[PDB]
């Protein structure tokens, strides 16, 4: 089974802030990206048992539209403009899972806005595929 990492703690934020306005988040809050481009959340301590493909499941809210994020693993961009589709409400928390390669031990994962801003981000769950 997996490990959940909160977006709001254990992370470095760039042009993004922790908030609690919309209910239903896990932990102490969620992250609101503020800039249409170059806002970011970086997890610096994702800790895996093995090297291989991981399921990374984002819990997020997005009232309308699709917003795209670049995704970096260990400093290298591995997904470009990955879509996050609407959930319908800022208090509807949906899920999106990507499959990405990661290493055993401690890894970093960063998600970055690229022109469409971002979903409000609650947490990620990482599971070996
Ligand atoms: Ca925002
Ligand atoms: Ca959270």
Which ligand is located closest to the Cα atom of residue 59? 2
| Residues 2, 56: Cα–Cα separation, whole Å | 9
Q: Indicate which technique resolved this structure.
A: X-ray
| Signed CA dihedral, 51, 55, 3, 5: sign only | positive
Please check if 33 is assigned to a binding site: yes
Q: What is the CATH number of the domain that holds 47?
A: 2.60.120.260
Number of compact structural domains in the chain: 1
Please check if 24 is assigned to a binding site: no
Residues 6+ apart with CB under 8 A from 17: 31, 32, 34
Please check if 126 is assigned to a binding site: yes
Give bridge partners of residue 124 from the DSSP assignment: 5, 58
Q: Which structural domain range is residue 107 located in?
A: 1-129
Residues 6+ apart with CB under 8 A from 90: 21, 22, 61, 62, 63, 120
Q: Which of 104, 118, 120 is nearest to 39 (CA)?
A: 118
């Amino acid at each position: 089974t997996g490990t959940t990492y909160e977006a709001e703690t254990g992370t470095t934020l760039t042009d993004a802030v922790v908030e609690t306005l919309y209910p239903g988040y896990t932990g102490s809050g969620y992250v609101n990206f503020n800039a249409y481009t170059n806002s970011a959340i970086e997890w610096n301590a994702i800790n895996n048992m093995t090297t291989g493909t991981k399921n990374v499941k984002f819990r997020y809210a997005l009232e309308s539209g699709t917003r795209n994020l670049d995704i970096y693993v260990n400093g290298t961009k591995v997904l470009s403009n990955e879509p996050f589709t609407e959930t319908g409400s800022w208090s509807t928390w949906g899920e999106k899972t990507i499959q990405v390669a990661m290493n055993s031990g401690v890894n970093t994962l960063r998600i970055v806005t690229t022109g469409t801003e971002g979903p409000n981000m609650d947490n990620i769950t990482v599971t070996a595929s």
